[PDB]
Amino acid sequence: SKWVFEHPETLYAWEGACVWIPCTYRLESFILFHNPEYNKQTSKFDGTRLYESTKDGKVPSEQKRVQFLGDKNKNCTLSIHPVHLQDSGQLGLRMESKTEKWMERIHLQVSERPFPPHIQLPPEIQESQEVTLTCLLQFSCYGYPIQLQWLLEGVPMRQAAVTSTSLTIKSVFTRSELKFSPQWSHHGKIVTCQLQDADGKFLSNDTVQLNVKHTPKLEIKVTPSDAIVREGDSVTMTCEVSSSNPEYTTVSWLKDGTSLKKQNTFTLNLREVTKDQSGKYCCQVSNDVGPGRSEEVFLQVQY
Amino acid sequence: DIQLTQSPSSLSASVGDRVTMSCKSSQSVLYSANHKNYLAWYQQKPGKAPKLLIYWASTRESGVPSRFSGSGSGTDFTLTISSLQPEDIATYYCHQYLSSWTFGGGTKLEIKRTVAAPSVFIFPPSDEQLKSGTASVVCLLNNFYPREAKVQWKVDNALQSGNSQESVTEQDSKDSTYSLSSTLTLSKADYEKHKVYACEVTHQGLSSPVTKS
Amino acid sequence: QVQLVQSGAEVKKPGSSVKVSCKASGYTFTSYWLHWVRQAPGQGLEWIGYINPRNDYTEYNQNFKDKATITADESTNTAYMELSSLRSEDTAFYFCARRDITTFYWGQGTTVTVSSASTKGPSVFPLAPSSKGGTAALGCLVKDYFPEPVTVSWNSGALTSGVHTFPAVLQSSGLYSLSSVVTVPSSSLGTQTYICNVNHKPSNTKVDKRVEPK
Ligand SMILES: *[C@@H]1O[C@H](CO)[C@@H](O[C@@H]2O[C@H](CO)[C@@H](O[C@@H]3O[C@H](CO[C@H]4O[C@H](CO)[C@@H](O)[C@H](O)[C@@H]4O)[C@@H](O)[C@H](O[C@H]4O[C@H](CO)[C@@H](O)[C@H](O)[C@@H]4O)[C@@H]3O)[C@H](O)[C@H]2NC(C)=O)[C@H](O)[C@H]1NC(C)=O
Ligand SMILES: *[C@@H]1O[C@H](CO)[C@@H](O[C@@H]2O[C@H](CO)[C@@H](O)[C@H](O)[C@H]2NC(C)=O)[C@H](O)[C@H]1NC(C)=O
Structure with a gap:
């Protein structure tokens, strides 16, 4: 009709912090209520009054808890410093111009404790492919600066994080994006995003246990590693997997680039060997990602 | 496919003794980032979940007694109980948790005492049980140490396999012995098809295998 | 306060299937992997598999791919483990467990x-x-x-x-x-x-x- 307002639908904060509420609209007096209730019986709005623009001599803003930072023509942004649990509920902006009156409601949800952030990761992380892990917190207020810190197994992750802050009519948040090149060994590790205040102090955090796809990593062993193998002797080689994500399907053995016929187990036994068995040996274990191979063992037969 | 080999499978030691048990991994569990070994030690009591003792191979968890300590790095680890207490009788497991989870075979801890040969008793089936259509013969092995024993049933000198079950008690809290009950079950016709029913007991405390027939 | 609560004892006929529940309390259910561990009578602890409750990605022990199916429900903060074709060797204690950075949390166990x-x-x-x-x-x-x-x-x-x-x-x-x-x-x-x-x-x-x- 005669009023248009724009602001986030819900604003989030916690006890002891501040809330900064962007607001635009399109005035004789402004009054901020908490949970305004119209009484039809007395024809008035009842409830606690958080701000009155009419009280003359009203002290400068930062000497008040509830501060109206707006104008007479476009701006209705608000500031609560400090914000309290009892402020949780509905903020009623009662505006009066010369003919019409309006009550605009903005939701302020105050938690007793700092709420946690939320990590957004790609559905597909694989080794040596760069991905941006994202940490999102739905809070920002100029009077209460904060920071987001990435941890790896409780240890301040070494990479650089990038922090950005949005305080608009559409959304209010602080976001951190950290780029890093995951390896096979991040799979199964715990990544944490800690929300802190200025000092390195804990407020809340979000946590993930990384799922990193990788081709199989292999460790090859040989029995006569320390010693001599002449003709006839026995030699045992084993193929160990360190990790594989997803699970492996088969195992194979290769000698000087050619795959050994009917040698698809994790143990290679050469018994009654000849000098022709000399050469370079490896194993191959296959993933749904692809195959991995271990190091080569060069068996030299002595005679 | 990361296997963990724990040794020994069972320890017997005195009250007040210092006890160690080893866990060797076929591959390294040392993580490259935080230079931590992703191996843990558990204590498990019967019917209960394992209780964590050591994490990252060397850190004792909260409220765990100081007699328990974990050491080692890479592929070799040792759990040490500085002064064995009666409440520490349990089975202990090692556990690697880098990506997936694998566990050691376990180390059963018991109290060591003087070797005691078992008293061997045999019970023939009752006439009451024969009226039901089944015959169970019970071999009883009472108060022996160590726990390792072998019970072989023989029916007309024919060794039995797959028709018997045994059960072993916990180490008794007063004489630190074990007891074993073995039940051989045959149909009535098969029972009446033979004459001599015996259990042969082989045990460290017996110079020769004992047979009750 | 952070505890895993498993379902009650289960008695199933051979060839049937069984689905054990594991309810999580006092933490964010999607933040840590949820594992399942088997302990046959007289044997040790054997790992079955895990599920990542955040993306429902699962990995298994090689020996349980034909046997166990681990699923999760974030709306109920409950993870599940289903056993398919039951035989005598399935009679065991089953635990659900998870790791924190510094410690483990285990369920009380369920007997199948x-x-x-x-x-x-x-x-x-x-x-x-x-x-x-x-x-x-x-x-x-x-x-x-x-x-x-x-x-x-x-x-x-x-x-x-x-x-x-x-x-x-x-x-x-x-x-x-x-x-x-x-x-x-x-x-x-x-x-x-x-x-x-x-x-x-x-x-x-x-x-x-x-x-x-x-
Ligand atoms: C209704 O009317 C009020 C009137 O106050 C408007 O309030 C202004 O809001 C803006 C942002 O919305 C405020 O701007 C902020 O100022 C802070 C201080 O500025 C400088 O501070 C020191 C120097 O004193 C410098 O070191 C610093 O770098 C700043 O240059 C900053 O903390 C803010 O910077 C951050 O945000 C902006 C954009 O959000 C980025 O450009 C910055 O890089 C940084 O990320 C920001 O500059 C301003 O202070 C408020 N007014 C007053 C008088 O203080 C409302 O915006 C208005 N409502 C609407 C809907 O328009
Ligand atoms: C992440 O948040 C959790 C939860 O708040 C923190 O865990 C708490 O840690 C303190 C001391 O470190 C303990 O007194 C609490 O009992 C813990 N609570 C829970 C639910 O575990 C954790 O420390 C934070 N940081 C990291 C890196 O995980």
């Missing part, structure tokens, strides 16, 4: 027992003492009952020296069987009557049995 049996009371048969040097052994054979909780006492609890009730065994018929024996002085044979008191509450079976020497 595979048998075709129904609540049945036991038969109590005497283990008669005979001549076959001052000590003799007698007892009671508590046979063919289901499920397991039976209690055996001697002389209404007035006889506790020489007594050993053995752990029950699960026979191939799916019924349990248990032996409870007493070591007594051989001169008491014939005198000071011995009576075993057998109680199986699931079937409301109470059997007193005098063990007389032949």
